[PDB]
UniProtKB/TrEMBL annotation, chain B:
NCBIfam families: PRK05738.2-4. It comes from the Bacteria. One of its GO terms (molecular function) is structural constituent of ribosome. This is Large ribosomal subunit protein uL23. It holds the Pfam family Ribosomal_L23. The lineage of its organism: Bacteria, Bacillati, Bacillota, Bacilli, Bacillales. InterPro entries: Nucleotide-bd_a/b_plait_sf, Ribosomal_uL23-like, Ribosomal_uL23/eL15/eS24_sf.
Automatic annotation (TrEMBL), chain C:
Residues 35-54, 211-270 are annotated as: Disordered. This is Large ribosomal subunit protein uL2. The lineage of its organism: Bacteria, Bacillati, Bacillota, Bacilli, Bacillales. The gene is rap. Signal peptide: none annotated. GO terms for cellular component: large ribosomal subunit. It comes from Staphylococcus aureus. Part of the 50S ribosomal subunit. Forms a bridge to the 30S subunit in the 70S ribosome.
Amino acid sequence: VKRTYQPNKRKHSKVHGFRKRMSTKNGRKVLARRRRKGRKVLSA
Amino acid sequence: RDILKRPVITEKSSEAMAEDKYTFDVDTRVNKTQVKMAVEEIFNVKVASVNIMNYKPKKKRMGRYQGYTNKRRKAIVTLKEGSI
Amino acid sequence: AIKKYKPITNGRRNMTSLDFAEITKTTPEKSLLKPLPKKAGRNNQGKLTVRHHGGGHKRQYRVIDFKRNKDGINAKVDSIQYDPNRSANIALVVYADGEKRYIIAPKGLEVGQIVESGAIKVGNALPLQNIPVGTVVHNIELKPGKGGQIARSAGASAQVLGKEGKYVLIRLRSGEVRMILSTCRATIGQVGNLQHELVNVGKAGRSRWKGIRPTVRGSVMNPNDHPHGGGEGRAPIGRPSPMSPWGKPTLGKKTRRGKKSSDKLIVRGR
RNA sequence: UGAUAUUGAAAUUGCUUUCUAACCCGCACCACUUAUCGUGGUGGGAGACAGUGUCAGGCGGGCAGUUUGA
RNA sequence: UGAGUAGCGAAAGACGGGUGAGAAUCCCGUCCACCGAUUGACUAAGGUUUCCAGAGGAAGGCUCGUCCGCUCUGGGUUAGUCGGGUCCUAAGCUGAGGCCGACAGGCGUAGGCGAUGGAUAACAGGUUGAUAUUCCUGUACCACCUAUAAUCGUAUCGAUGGGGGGACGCAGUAGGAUAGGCGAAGCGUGCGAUUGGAUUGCACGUCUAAGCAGUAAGGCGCUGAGCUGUGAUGGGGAGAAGUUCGAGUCGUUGAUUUCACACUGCCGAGAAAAGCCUCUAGAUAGAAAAUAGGUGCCCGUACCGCAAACCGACACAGGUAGUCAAGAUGAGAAUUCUAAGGUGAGCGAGCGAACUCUCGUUAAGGAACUCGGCAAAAUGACCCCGUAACUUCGGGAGAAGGGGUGCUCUUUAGGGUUAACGCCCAGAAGAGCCGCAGUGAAUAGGCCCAAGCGACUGUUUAUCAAAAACACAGGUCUCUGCUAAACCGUAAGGUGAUGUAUAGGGGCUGACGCCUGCCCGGU
RNA sequence: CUACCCUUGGUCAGGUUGAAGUUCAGGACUGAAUGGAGGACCGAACCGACUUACGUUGAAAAGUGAGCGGAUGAACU
């Protein structure tokens, strides 16, 4: 059976990367809210 | 300049020594042209060519806790005149 | 004319293609083609806003001129051709001092014609203030200098009725009687490729490689998908009127806002 | 669908006609500029109408909250 | 607790010798078996150091383990030409100005990013435990820099501008050529002890890019053209011989490769931009053919990659794009046995109880079973005859129903290739020999008579429903005159459509034949 | 993942039948050849999931065995 995660570096960085979070008001909210918690990895 | 950091002394390094080829670990941001002028400035030798390769950092433990080594840059200069 | 097919399977049984012996050359003129990617019923927002579009063969847009602007220079019909994206055929007309253009070919066209404010025979394109009453024209403008819009399909035509001082009265193919401003050009004749009406596409596959997807009837949808909704077993309409998918009376009701500025121009209905 | 602001000028009779400067044009041409965008000008069309604002009546399971006793 | 219970994840191992505290399992070896349009070779993604060597055996490994994709210590990835960037553009994304909008922001023009496509200069052999068009040897080509340059001069450079080209679908055969395959000549070894034989028996039979020509065909005296021959090459590989030596042939078959989207047919009418070549704008002003040298950046490159290393929590019968793809049998990439190369399944040893599962056979009967011939049997290949109703004239039709098939030897019109000889593909007929049986295994339609539904091919409830449901070609009614109607959005902007009533949206019906009656109370 | 779409690609052993058209002979039409159409036919790769068996603290949170359907297209990828 074909499962739901089919890894892809290009897609992963295009849809969850840093530059794609820094492009929205809400992506910036996401990164700020991960820094409030103090995560090690911000983006993916 | 001091872009050259270390000589490599391995089994394969010494093996290629016979072919008159020398290996160095250089800084992670240089060409193979800066390596060329650097070696020719330091050792006063004529360089025939220079290969270059990057190595990943590989994860090493030595204890409770994990972590990578350093990414390193392995240049290989083939001399034309002189040695070392 | 249409050419029958013998019933050798179930799917060419009742199916007629169109014969193409009014076509001269099969490859187009490279200087005039344009890419034309399929925006399959999706708008700029990416959403499907017109149903039943999608798929189909590739297309290369031919730059047809409907302006028909020239300083009374001659032309000459090189060759009729096929245009994948309109019912009518097109004709490569070369001009006297060496220009290439595409006209919509009216029926009976190989001669070589002109454009001007006053010549008239089939092919020419002149202003409606130089056309006598009873003539049939095609590819009429509506605003002076925009190209023609009306009577432009395959088998279309429009008679010039009488004339006002500033307007001329056209009878459209839908029975529409209208005033059109008397400086809007029009081409003489009828639009060829008249057999297009009679073709029988003959199979669901042939409908499907013209960019037409299956039209599901609203009566078999669920109640949240269509006003004709569900109901155990087949149910009738069960409403006072039929409704569109979006809750609009879809039969009989006049839905004409238009622009409410042609109303001083539209004499008759249809 | 009305009233009223943008909104003017003349006539017969609030109704009706005409006309240009407003407003408007997914009309043409020119310049920005080796841009089917936009802005400006010029020609043309429409024209105090449309579009828009505020008030009002109507239709309105298209969508919404709900009720549907013991 | 259940309980020393179920399970230990499809399958063939055996033995000898080692190593060792300890061996069914680790190493070696011989034999045996399994895959072989793949369990082999190479790659994209993805993983991310698992790759290699020397040590280790507390944990992981469904048992063991001296072993390991595990632990420790050291190592390993080499590019002017390979795949990306310093080239080009699709969809899409972003978009200064700009338009729209409670703010946030949406949209969008010039422009830019964006490969899965276009363009673009290197091949053969050797090598190490780990790289390999990268290192090394041999022979090349490309861009730029430099000096000498025979022959300087509107000769050079030419736009980001103009033009041509690039530049394109789908099917169908026909042809050329080559790869590969097969068979006999030249070499190279062995020549037998079980009856026999020595005309016997195995294994090999060449090789690049580039540069010189010139070449089926094709297109318009031009443009492109597979290919072949030559040197490259006194070089390298080479079964095998003793650092020194060693053959490299004609015959036939031939692709799914390539000429090549070529030619032809069709209708559904089949990307863009640059590199490229031109022309002048316009810089007013070198040599490219040659001689010699020189520089050439970044990123990836290890290993697995139908898998124990990727996605499934697992060392999981599942899923995973593309490339190469041999012999005998054949239409064939089918079936069966093998090649190349690779594997023997990470629990075993007994005994051969019930019972369950997979598989085989069965006297007489032959659906008597059951809700139902469900399951299993049967038929099945190629050549031959023969073939109903009905029908939209195509079909039904592989209708149904029957016959033949092995080996040998004779005669004997055949086909292709060749200067013939010689190979290659097809038979007729006749005479015989055998058996229970001759497509002797494997692979491979049961059929017929009727009724109902749907015309048909197709789609559907991922994970209990594949149908009579949906779609469909066709019919019809209805709206819409173009800034069309309809839909998305608050609007801008869009789609409809770079379309324009033979068109576009919506409702119902659903091939085709014949038909489609009455009513406007009411909504 | 999945449903539809857009752009750009790739895959689909083999064999059978024989539409128009055409040309030849006849006399609009006949027969012979040639041609090679089709959501044509049989059938592997590939894509499905009809039937039954097994499995159901599974090898697998949907699989396997035997058969089965499409297989140049409204195909698959």
